[PDB]
């Protein structure tokens, strides 16, 4: 009789979503800007390091 | 117990990188 | 064993506190050092043409085959698990022993990697070049441990594992987007980076736009759009939280808010799922390749699976795979969601974030939920935290399978890891800014 446990799980989960304060426009924009800045920093540092080291890998190897 | 700062770690990492480059260069020159 | 544990380098604790700007600078320096070390090829490598036996470990361990950081963050994870087991089975001596066991397992893993079959033929290499590669990987693992200690003792914002995983994933995404590498197979110079390819095709030649959007053999712009969409969705779902209005009773005058985030275990379900699936993949590949019906049931490797348990764990290769094998897609989605939920529900009890543990933390610190008695603090936590963890795992799995189905760049697991780790670094940012 797993129907009742599943129903309780889904109902309580949707209630939890209802009580949870979903982010608004300003908070979403701030967090997205911060994540974009962090991702850009990491990815572009790695990208430029790889471009720097490709000719170095060609020369040294 | 050996204790180092962050600058000793940075310098030791750079020395390891340089040692790998010189190892590759010596191998290339010896092969040729 | 005391002299053996104490004969190891260690990083001095910063007795004087370090400002946030210097912490960011040292984190960037460590990141740059790791990035340089993971692009430097190893010495003595005879050949790198064979298939990668541990290709599925690269994302989770933030590794790169043939370079110094091929083991990656394996020493940290192995040492942590080893001493967690030791503590379960029964102060700087603990850190020294952890470093020593990390070095020992690094030596063992380097021996396995060299003897696996890559680096060319070990017998032709001889005991000299193999030992030299073992020394290089040993020193690389020592550098990884030193960098993790640098990031964790106070000089760095986050840990080493999270920073290295996020850096590898972000670098992979940005490279797939903007790589200037040129590849041609009879259709002219086709740039390997989606955006640069779009610019090149527009300059050279509508048809260019469609080719840059639906370029099956290389990174797409539609894949980049899907990756951006998954970033936005995972950020929006990570912003979800349950604020518990709480007060203080042991000492008055302290007011605050207690957030129970939906992604209660931030990326631990992802890390556990990826580690389990990748270990299964490695074992299946090595077992099938080396030498049984049960082995075939473990996965008919062909490199992507074409049958078996590992196949059912693998994301569908295309919409045609779902059309021809809907059962495989259903089983894959169900296993992703169930494994995520179960791993999150296990972790909230193992890592001391259980509703009982949080209730004890509230009681010891003298925290009481507003509008509720002190005795019934645990009951509300019993109502919220277990569901929060289970549904956070389920939503994480749903986002992962959505990103995999959309063909996002960096894989769903990689994107979830990157977003969760970047959010952790952002909350570290705000904590150090407010403090």
Curated annotation (Swiss-Prot), chain A:
It is found in: Endoplasmic reticulum membrane. The SEC61 channel-forming translocon complex consists of channel-forming core components SEC61A1, SEC61B and SEC61G and different auxiliary components such as SEC62 and SEC63. The SEC61 channel associates with the multi-pass translocon (MPT) complex. (Microbial infection) May interact with Zika virus strain Mr-766 non-structural protein 4A/NS4A. May interact with Zika virus French Polynesia 10087PF/2013 non-structural protein 4A/NS4A. Its main location: endoplasmic reticulum. Residues 1-27 are cytoplasmic. One of its GO terms (cellular component) is membrane. The chain crosses the membrane at residues 28-56. GO terms for molecular function: protein transmembrane transporter activity; ribosome binding. One of its GO terms (biological process) is post-translational protein targeting to membrane, translocation. Residues 57-61 are extracellular. The modification Phosphoserine is found at residue 13. The keyword Repressor does not apply. The gene is SEC61G. This is Protein transport protein Sec61 subunit gamma.
Swiss-Prot record, chain B:
Residues 28-32 are lumenal. Keywords: Acetylation, Endoplasmic reticulum, Lipoprotein, Membrane, Palmitate, Phosphoprotein, Protein transport, Translocation, Transmembrane, Transmembrane helix, Transport. GO terms for molecular function: epidermal growth factor binding; guanyl-nucleotide exchange factor activity; ribosome binding; RNA binding. Its main location: endoplasmic reticulum. It comes from the Eukaryota. It is found in: Endoplasmic reticulum membrane. One of its GO terms (biological process) is post-translational protein targeting to membrane, translocation. Component of SEC61 channel-forming translocon complex that mediates transport of signal peptide-containing precursor polypeptides across the endoplasmic reticulum (ER). Forms a ribosome receptor and a gated pore in the ER membrane, both functions required for cotranslational translocation of nascent polypeptides. This is Protein transport protein Sec61 subunit beta. The gene is SEC61B. The chain holds residues 65 to 96 of 96 of the full protein.
Swiss-Prot record, chain C:
GO terms for cellular component: endoplasmic reticulum membrane; membrane; Sec61 translocon complex. Residues 46-68, 121-126, 176-219, 289-322, 410-413 are lumenal. It holds the Pfam family Plug_translocon. It is found in: Endoplasmic reticulum membrane. The chain crosses the membrane at residues 26-45, 69-88, 100-120, 127-147, 155-175, 220-240, 268-288, 323-343, 389-409, 414-430. One of its GO terms (biological process) is endoplasmic reticulum organization. Changing residue 77 to D: In CVID15; likely pathogenic; decreased function in cotranslational protein targeting to endoplasmic reticulum. Expressed in proximal and distal tubules in kidney (at protein level). Keywords: Chaperone, Disease variant, Endoplasmic reticulum, Membrane, Protein transport, Translocation, Transmembrane, Transmembrane helix, Transport. Changing residue 167 to A: In ADTKD5; likely pathogenic; decreases in protein stability; partly confers novel Golgi subcellular location. Residues 1-25, 148-154, 241-267, 344-388 are cytoplasmic. Changing residue 59 to G: In ADTKD5; decreases in protein stability; partly confers novel Golgi subcellular location. PROSITE patterns: SECY_1 (PS00755), SECY_2 (PS00756). It is a multi-pass membrane protein. Its main location: endoplasmic reticulum. One of its GO terms (molecular function) is calcium channel activity. Component of SEC61 channel-forming translocon complex that mediates transport of signal peptide-containing precursor polypeptides across the endoplasmic reticulum (ER). Forms a ribosome receptor and a gated pore in the ER membrane, both functions required for cotranslational translocation of nascent polypeptides. May cooperate with auxiliary protein SEC62, SEC63 and HSPA5/BiP to enable post-translational transport of small presecretory proteins. Belongs to the SecY/SEC61-alpha family. The SEC61 channel-forming translocon complex consists of channel-forming core components SEC61A1, SEC61B and SEC61G and different auxiliary components such as SEC62 and SEC63. The SEC61 channel associates with the multi-pass translocon (MPT) complex.
């Amino acid at each position: 009789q797993f129907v009742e446990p599943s129903r309780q799980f889904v109902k309580d989960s949707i209630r939890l979503v209802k009580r949870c304060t979903k982010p608004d426009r300003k908070e979403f924009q701030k967090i997205a800007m911060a994540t974009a800045i962090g991702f850009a920093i990491m990815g572009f540092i790695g990208f430029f390091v790889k471009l720097i080291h490709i000719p170095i890998n060609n020369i040294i190897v | 117990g050996l204790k180092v700062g962050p600058v000793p770690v940075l310098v030791m990492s750079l020395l390891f990188i340089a040692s790998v480059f010189m190892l590759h260069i010596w191998g290339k020159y010896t092969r040729s | 064993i005391k002299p053996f544990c104490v004969i190891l380098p260690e990083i001095q604790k910063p007795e004087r506190k370090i400002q946030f700007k210097e912490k960011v600078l040292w984190t960037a320096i460590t990141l740059f050092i790791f990035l340089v070390c993971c692009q430097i090829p190893l010495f003595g490598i005879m050949s790198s043409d064979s298939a990668d036996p541990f290709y599925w470990m690269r994302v989770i361990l933030a590794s790169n085959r043939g370079t110094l950081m091929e083991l990656g963050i394996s020493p940290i994870v192995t040492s942590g698990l080893i001493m967690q087991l030791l503590a379960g089975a029964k102060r700087a001596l603990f850190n020294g022993a952890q470093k020593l066991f990390g070095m020992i397992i690094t030596i063992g893993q380097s021996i396995v990697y060299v003897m696996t079959g890559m680096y060319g033929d070990p017998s032709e290499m001889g005991a000299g070049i193999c030992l030299l590669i073992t020394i290089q990987l040993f020193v690389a693992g020592l550098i990884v441990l030193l960098l993790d200690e640098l990031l964790q003792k106070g000089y760095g914002l986050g840990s080493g594992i999270s920073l290295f995983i996020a850096t590898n994933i972000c670098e992979t995404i940005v490279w797939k987007a903007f790589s200037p590498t040129t590849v041609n197979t009879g259709r002219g110079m086709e740039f390997e980076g989606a955006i640069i390819a779009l610019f090149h095709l527009l300059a050279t030649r509508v048809r260019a736009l469609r080719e840059a959007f639906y370029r099956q053999n290389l990174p797409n712009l539609m894949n980049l759009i899907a990756t951006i969409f998954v970033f936005a969705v995972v950020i929006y779902f990570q912003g979800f939280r349950y604020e518990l209005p709480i007060r203080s009773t042991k000492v008055r005058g302290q007011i605050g808010i207690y957030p129970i985030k939906l992604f209660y275990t931030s990326n631990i379900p992802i890390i556990l799922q990826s580690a389990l699936v990748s270990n299964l993949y490695v074992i299946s590949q090595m077992l099938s390749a080396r030498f049984n019906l049960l082995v075939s049931l473990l996965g008919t490797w062909s490199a992507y699976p074409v049958g078996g348990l590992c196949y059912y764990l693998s994301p569908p290769e295309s919409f045609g795979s779902v059309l021809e094998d809907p059962v495989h897609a259903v089983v894959y989605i169900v296993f992703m969601l169930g494994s995520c939920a179960f791993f999150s529900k296990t972790w909230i009890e193992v890592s001391g974030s259980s509703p009982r543990d949080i209730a004890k933390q509230f009681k010891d610190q003298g925290m009481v939920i507003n509008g509720k008695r002190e005795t019934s603090i645990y009951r509300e936590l019993k109502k919220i935290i277990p569901t929060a963890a289970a549904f956070g795992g389920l939503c994480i799995g749903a986002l992962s399978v959505l990103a995999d189905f959309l063909g996002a760049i960096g894989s769903g697991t990689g994107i979830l890891l990157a977003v969760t780790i970047i959010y952790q670094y952002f909350e570290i940012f705000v904590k150090e800014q407010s403090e």
